[PDB]
Amino acid sequence: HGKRLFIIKPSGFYDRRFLKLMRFYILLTGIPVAIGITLVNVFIGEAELADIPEGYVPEHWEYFKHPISR
């Protein structure tokens, strides 16, 4: 049936544009951060606890576990 009518509604252009822009920038910086975190976790991090060897004094950043924290 060719009874298609017009739906009067406010402009959804600006709302959609703002949402797209916000998502674009958030992802623009979050995707590299997530990729870097994943690579660091798989390849490098998660040190294991040890005893301090006698006669050796560690530096301040050697008392932490996660590599990004160090």
């Binding site: 822009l21 916000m22 920038y25 958030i26 623009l28 910086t29 979050g30 951060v33 975190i37 950043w61 932490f64 576990k65 996660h66 990004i68 924290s69 160090r70």
Partner: protein
């Protein structure tokens, strides 16, 4: 009463100007489209991309200067020592009574 009924020479109240009329895609920052667009870009980038993401990640991975796991390990070793030696865990007095000189009442 030939008075003009006018108190003073005043400009009429101007009508508010729509930013969309002279420039669609106006972003609500400025009336000049180029400065407007660059203001939108810098605000979105430097807020969402830089601060809201990088600073949040930085805060998430802050090193333990509050020393929580250190306290966990200290408590674990102390409870291991005390259970094994028969000591009754935590002690009621925080300081050893031998080193406090109470004042004699003699009442």
């Amino acid at each position: 009463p030939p008075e003009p009924t006018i108190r003073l020479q005043e400009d009429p109240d101007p009508e508010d100007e729509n930013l969309y009329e002279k420039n669609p895609d106006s972003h609500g920052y400025d009336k000049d489209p180029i400065v407007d667009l660059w203001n939108m870009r810098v605000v979105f980038f430097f807020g969402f991309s830089i601060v809201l993401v990088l600073g949040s990640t930085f805060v998430a991975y802050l090193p333990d200067y509050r020393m929580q796991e250190w306290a966990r390990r200290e408590a674990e070793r102390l409870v291991k020592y005390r259970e094994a030696n028969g000591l009754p865990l935590m002690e009621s007095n925080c300081f050893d009574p031998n080193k406090i000189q109470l004042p004699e009442d003699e009442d």
